[PDB]
Design a protein around this ligand. Structure first.
Ligand code: ANP
Ligand code: ANP
Ligand code: K
Ligand code: K
Ligand code: MG
Ligand code: MG
Lengths: 607, 613
């Protein structure tokens, strides 16, 4: 029964006091430097972001005041002997009260205040990175003492000094000889001395700060060399630049078969490039030219993970650890827009180049099939379904058709789409479920790839037309002499073959095999790898055999049945084997090799 | 062009100033309530954790003095019409001083102070959740008016008041009629009203706080129903209780075929339980892309970042660990040093567990291997350190020539019965033993006297190649060992050369092999395992230019002997038969991409091969 203690017999009989929220700083520093960032290496990323923000501030101030632009670069210095990493820029710089307000206060960012006083949102609002005010304190998880030397770019400002150890106290002083900008000296912790190595610093800078708007120098060498091609015009960027850019973001060496430069910003300011790898079997997320996460499996659907590239947006919501605010109230709109655009782009690619898209299909067909089954909204499934290509009975072999054009030639009277799932076209065209509708002039799609039977049930509908599985619907030998041959073949092949029938549509093949139970035909293929014992093969599927008397081999078996019964008994098994191979029910015909080899030696005994 | 601006020309001339770090409280509240927690529904998870911490504090206080323990419970009250959610517990409660110190201060946590005041670190140190002091302020993610009532459980405390809009200022007063324990009233935002429904609250509480240490009532519905069987001794929990918990974590209705209750404290404080489903793993589920962490009995939701090895994704369960470092948003510290050690420790235990399972019930493990063996094979190839490859290799089961059909052998015990000084493990790939016993490559090995393993399942050849050695013995395939190791001499030579004339575009070299007895021909490749890997998944004249199909013939075979007179008496038939002989070797090697092309030549061969009959 009901059991609750919630009640409203409670009132207020006190005096309304006025307390302002407090915040102890020791635990805040401990949280920032111990339990805020997943990886220890992001401190140089945050420092480079601060340097880039300072350089952007100086550039904006200079262009607003209308004078020359001096050298503005970020210099990373690493001294292995001293165990220190030094970052220095030529940004705006910071004064006494500026240092006290920005560096000495948690969550207080001067970048946000500068952005609020910009009132244009077009000059540098999309380039200022800092928004939280805790980025600098990420340097304390690697350093036992941080030395910051800054001097404002104002005409007359004096240099200052900033010492701290992360214990809630910082000793700011006065320094002379400070060059314009900010010079941050970091003395690494005993357990964090590995950041005093040039290799690690270069690796982290390439991982995070490879696309900084300003020159980045590590030990005196410029090492950015990547001008963020996702930010320029799609027509201005050449195709050759896309080749190495894909090799960088995807960490591959091949070429991209497709390249989509998406820049339309209806929901969010998106500057993204999407690549499709050539290697038949994961998009980098960026915010203001700073990497957020490499995998970024949240912005794109799981079935779209096969594409590579970059997605850059300056309006995405970021976590305090500068990572993606996954499953935010706003990110889901971006996922649908990206998903619809790629589907629209793929559809356009199919029309522009059918053969290229057809080749592209089997490389990543399992991804589209995965999308339909894992999709929740039915309308979403219809979008991916437009990307599917299938072979049709009314169209010759080797060419594929999509669902949309299949319904284009669909009869007006009928309302449902018929699809048949078979290992290959040859066996599909002979199944009795297929010619059941061949009496009428209907058209059926032939399904070949695996998991394709799985997705059609989940799709269950296309363009208001239901998908109906066909399975669930339900010169020549004399006639007299051919029949007596049929009875003999039903004795020697009694177990394997249910019945043998005459075929009038053969030119050079002595015999094929036909199945009644395509549901169990795939069972035969899956058991080829394991437990393909010949004796048990007959009971599993019970294959049916069809032959033509016009063939020479069939015409030869007439005399072989009596003159050489031993050779005939081995040849009829061999003819059955080739029928199995031609229809594709057997992947590797290793079993027939042993019997074929001994068949040939007595096939030439009189030569 | 190496230029740098870094120098040490700077010197200090002034006197250092004394300063302390500050903090913008309003901006801190904005950060916590807007850009701290990715998922907006974790606010009641944080508040339920706070209620559990308060209840644990009260229980510890009331057992320290050893008196009666009153009822302990957590109530989730939802009022859809008012658009409010109530979270009331019967914990210690808070006075005016505690309300101002804890609730009014960011990062100030009374649980951490209580933990440090324990002076024993043995009773409640492992079961207090709050450690940061910002968990409460997650309520401002959905609430524009947070209303908290609290009163300490001290003998003679009085109720109080707590109002805040998240604007950096909060109102505290005195309230009469307050019952013992903290009561929290949350007034939901206009855009966050979805938490004023029973279904959403039930879903999120099930998502995070099923295993709280106290009864949790959602509108009078006690919804724990699972007392965290991974806490008590492994022997205490029964088999039937394992199933009920397995249905929850795995979200499946089947039974677990294996159960590993792991509880260690030396490397890490781990209370983990692992289940292996008895159902056949879905071949679609394998293609698409495990365990759920618990820390102080709350779910962290870090299924990503493969905390468990990728090949171990087939097991379901929970890994409880009170020492893993959580970040502010209460998720994992991804790619940390400690979490990597957790993956290594868990991998060794799971590998050791399966080894013991194989030695316990070989028949049961044989069924287990044929179901989840693709994961072990996938793990070996994707492993980057050699040591773990042998650890997974002990889980592999193969059947060998020495043992009868249907009996599987491990790599370790196969290496136990080798010769005195043979540093070579021999394996052969074929769909079945019958097709492996009669394979020409195994026939050539009958000259030697060594035990050889048979590889039946798919991707098994690639697995041995990636392992490449086991127990300091190399893994040499049967095909590879051929290359590294009747008819008169005269007549064979022109037959030898003539085949090369007709198969110049297909075969590179053909040479005599006396090892073969009942096979007319055999084809050997240097990297046969790679060649089989090449042509199967990633995929005639163009194929031969890269594969180098070195064919071999057996002069003692009747068919090769028959090629003597057929090469001269019936020259037309000789070329066609050799093409069949050459193609037959490929099938024995499994290098045929599509045998549908060869049957047409095969069928028309039989027209003229026996046309005289
Ligand atoms: N090298 C620098 N040069 C000039 N100003 C700086 C520099 N580093 C930091 N600052 C200032 O000090 C503030 C505090 O640093 P920081 O913690 O990075 O805040 P933020 O970068 O603006 N926000 P966040 O995204 O967390 O980094 C910044 O907002 C800047 O105003
Ligand atoms: N329902 C409650 N009953 C009693 N004390 C409470 C309650 N909620 C919060 N507190 C106290 O207020 C403090 C601040 O809350 P909170 O932000 O959750 O800190 P925390 O839980 O200890 N650390 P965290 O993991 O971030 O939640 C807690 O540490 C408790 O001391
Ligand atoms: K700051
Ligand atoms: K607090
Ligand atoms: Mg910053
Ligand atoms: Mg808490």
């Amino acid at each position: 029964p009901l059991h609750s203690i919630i009640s409203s017999t409670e009132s207020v009989q006190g005096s309304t006091s006025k307390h302002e929220f407090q915040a102890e700083t020791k635990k805040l520093l401990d949280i920032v430097a111990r339990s805020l960032y997943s990886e220890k290496e992001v401190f140089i990323r945050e420092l480079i972001s601060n340097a880039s923000d300072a350089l952007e501030k100086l550039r904006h101030k200079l262009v607003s005041d209308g004078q020359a632009l001096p050298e503005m670069e970020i210099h990373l210095q690493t001294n292995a002997e001293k165990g220190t990493i030094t970052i220095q820029d030529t940004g705006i710089g910071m004064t006494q009260e500026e240092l006290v307000s920005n560096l000495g206060t948690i969550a207080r960012s001067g970048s946000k205040a500068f952005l609020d006083a910009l009132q244009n949102q077009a000059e540098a609002s999309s380039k200022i990175i800092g928004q939280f005010g805790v980025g600098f304190y990420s340097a304390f998880m690697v350093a036992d003492r941080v030395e910051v030397y800054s001097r404002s770019a104002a005409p007359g400002s004096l240099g200052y000094q900033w010492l701290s150890d992360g214990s809630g106290v910082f000793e700011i002083a006065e320094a002379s000889g400070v060059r314009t900008g900010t010079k941050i000296i970091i003395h690494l912790k005993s357990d964090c001395k590995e950041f005093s190595s040039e290799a690690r610093v270069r690796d982290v800078v390439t991982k995070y700060s490879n696309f900084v708007s300003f020159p980045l120098y590590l030990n005196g060498r410029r090492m950015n060399t990547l001008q963020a091609i996702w930010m320029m015009d799609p027509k201005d960027v050449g195709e050759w630049q896309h080749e190495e850019f894909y090799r960088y973001v995807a960490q591959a060496h091949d070429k991209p078969r497709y390249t989509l430069h998406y820049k339309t910003d209806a929901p969010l300011n998106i500057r993204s490039i999407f690549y499709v790898p050539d290697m038949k079997p994961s998009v980098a997320l960026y915010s203001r030219k700073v990497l957020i996460q490499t995998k970024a499996t949240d912005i794109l659907p799981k079935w779209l993970r096969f594409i590579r590239g970059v997605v850059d947006s300056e309006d995405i919501p970021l976590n305090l650890s500068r990572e993606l605010l996954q499953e935010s109230a706003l990110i889901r709109k971006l996922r649908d827009v990206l998903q619809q655009r790629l589907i629209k782009f793929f559809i356009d690619q199919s029309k522009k180049d059918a053969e290229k898209y057809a080749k592209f299909f089997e490389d990543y067909g399992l991804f589209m099939r995965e999308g339909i089954v894992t999709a929740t909204e039915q309308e979403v499934k219809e979008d991916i379904a437009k990307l599917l290509r299938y072979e049709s009975s009314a169209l010759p072999s080797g060419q594929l058709t999509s669902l949309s054009e299949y319904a284009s030639r669909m009869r007006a009277g009928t309302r449902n789409i018929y699809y048949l799932c078979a290992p290959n076209r040859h066996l599909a065209e002979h199944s009795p479920y297929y010619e059941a509708m061949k009496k009428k002039d209907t058209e059926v799609l032939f399904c070949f790839e695996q998991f394709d039977e799985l997705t059609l049930l989940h799709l269950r509908e296309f363009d208001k037309k239901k998908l109906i599985s066909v399975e669930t619907d339900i010169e020549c030998l004399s006639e007299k002499e051919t029949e007596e041959l049929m009875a003999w073949m039903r004795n020697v092949l009694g177990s394997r073959v249910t019945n043998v029938k005459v075929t009038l549509r053969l030119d050079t093949h002595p015999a094929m095999v036909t199945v009644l139970e395509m549901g169990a035909a795939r069972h035969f293929l899956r058991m080829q790898q394991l437990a393909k014992t010949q004796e048990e093969r007959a009971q599993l599927l019970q294959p049916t055999l069809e032959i033509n008397p016009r063939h020479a081999l069939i015409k030869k078996l007439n005399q072989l049945r009596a003159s050489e019964p031993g050779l005939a008994q081995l040849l009829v098994d061999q003819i059955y084997e080739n029928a199995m191979i031609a229809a594709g029910l057997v992947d590797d015909p290793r079993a027939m090799v042993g019997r074929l080899n001994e068949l040939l030696v007595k096939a030439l005994e009189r030569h």
